[PDB]
Design a protein around this nucleic acid. Structure first.
Ligand SMILES: [Mg+2]
Ligand SMILES: [Mg+2]
Ligand SMILES: [Mg+2]
Ligand SMILES: [Mg+2]
Ligand SMILES: [Mg+2]
Ligand SMILES: [Mg+2]
Ligand SMILES: [Mg+2]
Ligand SMILES: [Mg+2]
Ligand SMILES: [Mg+2]
Ligand SMILES: [Mg+2]
Ligand SMILES: [Mg+2]
Ligand SMILES: [Mg+2]
Ligand SMILES: [Mg+2]
Ligand SMILES: [Mg+2]
Ligand SMILES: [Mg+2]
Ligand SMILES: [Mg+2]
Ligand SMILES: [Mg+2]
Ligand SMILES: [Mg+2]
Ligand SMILES: [Mg+2]
Ligand SMILES: [Mg+2]
Ligand SMILES: [Mg+2]
Ligand SMILES: [Mg+2]
Ligand SMILES: [Mg+2]
Ligand SMILES: [Mg+2]
Ligand SMILES: [Mg+2]
Ligand SMILES: [Mg+2]
Ligand SMILES: [Mg+2]
Ligand SMILES: [Mg+2]
Ligand SMILES: [Mg+2]
Ligand SMILES: [Mg+2]
Ligand SMILES: [Mg+2]
Ligand SMILES: [Mg+2]
Ligand SMILES: [Mg+2]
Lengths: 97, 146, 135
RNA sequence: GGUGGGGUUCCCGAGCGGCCAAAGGGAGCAGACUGUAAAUCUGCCGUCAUCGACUUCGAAGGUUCGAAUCCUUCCCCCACCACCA
RNA sequence: CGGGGGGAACCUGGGGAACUGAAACAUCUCAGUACCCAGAGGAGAGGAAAGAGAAAUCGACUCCCUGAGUAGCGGCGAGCG
RNA sequence: CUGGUGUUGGCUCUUGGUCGCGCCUGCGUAGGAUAGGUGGGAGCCUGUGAACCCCCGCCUCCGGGUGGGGGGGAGGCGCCG
RNA sequence: GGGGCCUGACUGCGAGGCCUGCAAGCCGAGCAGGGGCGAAAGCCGGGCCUAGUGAACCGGUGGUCCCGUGUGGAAGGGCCA
């Protein structure tokens, strides 16, 4: 779980290519690969603490989607309860569909 | 990053203004302190709503202000007093002038909005000035044998 | 003041921010002569050449259409007389368009960048009028 | 192959447009000083040579009134970068 | 109210080798194979054009034949396609 | 290990770049010259306050260049040499 | 060995052979064009001769015009050096 609770962005697998030599575009013979290996790219995940009802609610988010967390507190009506949750905010309050 | 201000901020802006600020400043200072709120079209609409309900009910003030003003520049209020001559034994105070409307001509004024500043003694042609916000002079003459 | 009030009067007539047409210029240059005898009108241009080089020079001879009645210096600017301030507004416009298209001819190959970078129509004693040499 | 540097009196070396024989250091020659060697100090020092005159600054040309300076090119060195089927 | 666990193979998705080939070997091959994990279900997937691609052209997706070992791709090698 | 950039904000002082606009910048005694270049130019500038002493800035080949307020109250440059 | 003219250390090709596993290497009359030396016959496609050399791939550079992903271009290739 290095994963966005808003976007769902999760780490991905990317090759890493070691290239040598002069571009053909620059009048070289063109590039060579001296290696390819796997690696992950992570989402740039950050904490967002937010106060909703009387409660302090913490999202793990891609920095990309940090705004959405604040649009998500902007629909706040029916929870005087607890914990927990809510995070009843969450998916249902995201696109609802 | 655009934000609606909920209090005057000593530059930045003052209340209700839309000023555009660094998202860091916005998210970790302004918003959580209630000093601002987001410039969302939903909340840019709420402002625009409440921008209209001010300058409406402020033309409600001026509604019945320059309304009433235009009825009271066309009226003269005559009050009889037991005057002897040019010194009233009694006096006419603001609250009196008030009753002198509610009775004679059937109109009501504050009186606390009159600007008499100590009661009328003696007599003559009087012009005082009334309120709230741009407003009317009333003309009343204090007369004799009550 | 660095200029007499005679000139100071002329400094309120021109917004140098505006890029004028020659037609805007040739007419507005008549208000630009307060001198008690007849002024001479000049067209100046800073050029797209490096003069320090032998082959980047601009010079020739010109006979102006409306008659009298050019070479670049070492800093790459250039100056010649187009006529007199007595000439009619239309008799200036044709003498301005005479010098403009006269210089364009002489452009050296090694000229790097635009040939007319700035063109100011002035008078002998007058202020600078920033104009569009292409209009 | 590229970019940045350079070239100067015997070695070095600054070096400027308002002219710089062109600062200075050293070497060299002649002078004083002398235990030795040196240090210090004086003139010589591109050259003819009499003030002064005449070349000269990598090279050729060019700008300009004016070139050891600015410019185009050539040339060689320094340096760094990159590339190689 | 629902889930949970199981199922020969088949399916999708998340991950993912190496021997080997290149008569050495590193890009490349083997191969998105083996294998691990999650899930679906009698199938699964895909699917109703922000498609093709040269014609005023076709008309969702899947599957077979063909196009074709073509077009390409390639230490322009092995080979892939 | 490290530059940029995301998370990442308030207030400042300090600079470098460039573009623009305003303003000064410059000397061989030699032209009386203490002249940056090239146009146009014998004429402007001025008692909307000049030459000039007086404080004052900054520059300086230290001669002057040279602005800031004014006392000052008509002259001062140029062709002409 | 010396001297006078010149630059064929040409372009387009090439009968036919030497050699030879392949690939290569070698010699070459003769035609065409345009030349050079000679009065001319003629000679000249480097040097008395046999070593002074390196497939293909990938790129550089100058051409030319051949291809130019719907069309004109361009990008990028090809061809020749
Ligand atoms: Mg990488
Ligand atoms: Mg945070
Ligand atoms: Mg993003
Ligand atoms: Mg973003
Ligand atoms: Mg930001
Ligand atoms: Mg001795
Ligand atoms: Mg002795
Ligand atoms: Mg089930
Ligand atoms: Mg199951
Ligand atoms: Mg998979
Ligand atoms: Mg998964
Ligand atoms: Mg799999
Ligand atoms: Mg392997
Ligand atoms: Mg192996
Ligand atoms: Mg092998
Ligand atoms: Mg093998
Ligand atoms: Mg082995
Ligand atoms: Mg594969
Ligand atoms: Mg299962
Ligand atoms: Mg199905
Ligand atoms: Mg289905
Ligand atoms: Mg589906
Ligand atoms: Mg494959
Ligand atoms: Mg000058
Ligand atoms: Mg043969
Ligand atoms: Mg012939
Ligand atoms: Mg002959
Ligand atoms: Mg032959
Ligand atoms: Mg190969
Ligand atoms: Mg074509
Ligand atoms: Mg296309
Ligand atoms: Mg096309
Ligand atoms: Mg091409």
């Amino acid at each position: 779980s290095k994963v966005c609770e808003i976007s769902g962005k999760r780490p991905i697998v990317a090759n890493s290519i070691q290239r040598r030599g002069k571009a053909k575009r620059e009048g070289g013979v063109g590039k060579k690969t001296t290696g390819i290996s796997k690696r992950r790219q992570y989402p740039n995940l950050q904490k967002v603490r937010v106060r909703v009802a009387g409660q302090e609610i913490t999202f793990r988010v891609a920095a990309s989607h940090i705004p959405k967390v604040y649009e998500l507190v902007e629909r706040a009506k029916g929870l005087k309860l607890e914990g927990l949750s809510p995070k009843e905010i969450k998916k249902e309050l995201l696109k609802l569909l | 990053m655009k934000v609606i201000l909920l209090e005057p901020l000593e530059n930045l802006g003052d209340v209700g203004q839309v000023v555009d600020v660094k998202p860091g400043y916005a998210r970790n200072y302004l918003l959580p302190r209630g000093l601002a709120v987001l410039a969302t079209e939903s909340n840019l609409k709420a402002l625009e709503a409440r921008i209209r309900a001010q300058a409406k009910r402020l033309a409600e003030r001026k509604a019945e202000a320059e309304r009433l003003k235009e009825i009271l520049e066309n009226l003269t209020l005559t009050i009889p007093v037991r005057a002897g001559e040019t010194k009233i034994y009694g006096s006419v105070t603001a609250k009196d002038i008030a009753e002198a409307l509610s009775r004679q001509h059937g109109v009501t004024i504050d009186p606390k909005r009159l600007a008499l500043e100590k009661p009328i003694k003696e007599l003559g042609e009087y012009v005082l000035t009334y309120k709230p916000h741009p407003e009317v002079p009333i003309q009343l003459k204090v007369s004799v044998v009550a | 003041p660095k200029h007499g009030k005679r000139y100071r009067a002329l400094l309120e007539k021109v917004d140098p921010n505006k890029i004028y047409t020659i037609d805007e210029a040739a007419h507005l240059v008549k208000e630009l002569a307060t001198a008690k005898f007849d002024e001479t009108v000049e067209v100046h241009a800073k050029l797209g050449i490096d003069p320090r080089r032998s082959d980047q020079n601009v010079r020739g001879t010109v006979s102006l259409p409306h008659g009298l009645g050019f070479r670049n210096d070492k800093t790459g600017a250039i100056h010649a007389p187009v006529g007199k301030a007595s000439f009619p507004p239309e008799k200036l416009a044709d003498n301005i368009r005479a010098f403009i298209r006269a210089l364009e001819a002489h452009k050296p190959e090694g000229a790097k960048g635009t040939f007319l970078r700035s063109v100011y129509v002035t008078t002998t004693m007058g202020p600078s009028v920033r104009i569009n040499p292409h209009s």
